[PDB]
Each structure stands twice: as structure tokens, then as C-alpha cells.
Amino acid sequence: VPLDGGRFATSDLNDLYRRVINRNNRLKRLLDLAAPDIIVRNEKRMLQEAVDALLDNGRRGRAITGSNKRPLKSLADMIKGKQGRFRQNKRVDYSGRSVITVGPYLRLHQCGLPKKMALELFKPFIYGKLELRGLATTIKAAKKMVEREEAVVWDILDEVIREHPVLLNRAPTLHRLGIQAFEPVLIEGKAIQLHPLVCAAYNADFDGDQMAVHVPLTLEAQLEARALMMSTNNILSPANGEPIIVPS
């Protein structure tokens, strides 16, 4: 890919494939020019070190990169463990994060969610209403009504969030109680409020700890966030029958 400015950003295989097709391309020549068996016999020995620097580079002299002083990254150094698999076990759309705070007026099953965030995760839902209630002729003219922050969308956004559970989850998620759904309530600010009883399940002090907030999208996925995962089903920690919502 070409970077911005003139430079390119090559992957580290085009530095290794060029080194096999070059050495292989020469060894095709020595068998026509008919060199002695001290050179061509040194060619195959030199090719075979470059097909085996492609598969798993490092079980040899470690053919470090040119124009730089770090070892190249071969194919079998792309599946190998980063402690997590190359594939899935993944980043994710419809997310966010902010500084949690207290909000001790909430019921047990609802967390705050600032206006400036919820207007950004629930965008493709809001586009549904503004073209369903006729308030926008076409979708390109609903994208300019949410950017203006017109005073109509603040009353459509609050009906997209009627019973739509979200998924607060803290960073080092030890046990299954570290992910719990909640029913948002729109506040004003930029801190995700959170009922004080639950803050001992996440193990969250309120001194700067942040918390992502996902969004169950489909229709079978906002029932699994309301039957299985809701915050009023987990009043008993799975490790033992003792409660987990003890007033702290």
C-alpha cells in the first residue's frame, strides 16, 4: 500500500519472495552457462537456505532484514502465538468507553448512557425512524438531520432506546459476572453512570476506571441480553451460592 507522502509500506514477505525468485532465477542460469560443480553446488545450498527462511525463519542463521536491524517475519511466524490466535481466539463495531461514575438514584437494572454516545451507537436505528415517520425523504437527508442535532432527533432517539439492553463490560474480565447487560437511561455528560451495588462484581472503584459498552444488535441477541445476561438474574455468584449483590 502507498503511504501518504510518497513512501510505501510493504509487508515483510515481499522482502523474502524476492530472495527466492532471485536465487532460483540465477540457478536456472548456471545450468545453461555450465559452471563447475563448486558454484552450482553452492547455489542449491544457497537456495535451500532461502526456501527455509520463508517457511519458518529462525531455525537457522536468522536472516535479518535488510535496510534495518530486526529479523524478518516469515509465514510460520504469522500463525504462531501472540497468546491469542491470529483469527478469533477480534475488534468490534458499535462500542465505546468512558469514565464510570456513581449515580446512586438508579434502579438495579439500568445504567446511564450519555446523549453524545447513544446518538452514535444507535445511528443505524435512528435512520430507521427518520425515514419511517416521514421526517426525512431519503437516507442522505437523514444523515444531515442527525449531524445538525436538530431538536426532533432527541425525541426519536429516546424511542429507539425503549427496551434495548446494552452490555457494559470492564477490562480484565475474570469471571462471567464481569459482563452484564443493563437498560440505558439517557443522561447528560460524558461518564457512564452505574448502580453502586453492581460495582463490586466488576471490581470497579470509581477513580478513573473505564468500561466499554457494546450493543446487542439482532432480535435474538437482545433477548439473550434480557433473559440470560440481565443484571437482575445474577444475584448468586456461580463459584458458590453466596450472594454477589451484598451492599458493600
Binding site: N42, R45, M46, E49, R60, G61
Partner: peptide, 14 residues
């Protein structure tokens, strides 16, 4: 005499 040498440049000169 093949003292576990690996890199060819050791083997070319040898």
C-alpha cells in the same frame, strides 16, 4: 572437522 557449522560462508571458504 565439520564442527557443527551452519552458515554457508563458513562452508564456502571451508
Amino acid at each position: 572437522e565439520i564442527g557443527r557449522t551452519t552458515d554457508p560462508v563458513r562452508m564456502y571458504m571451508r
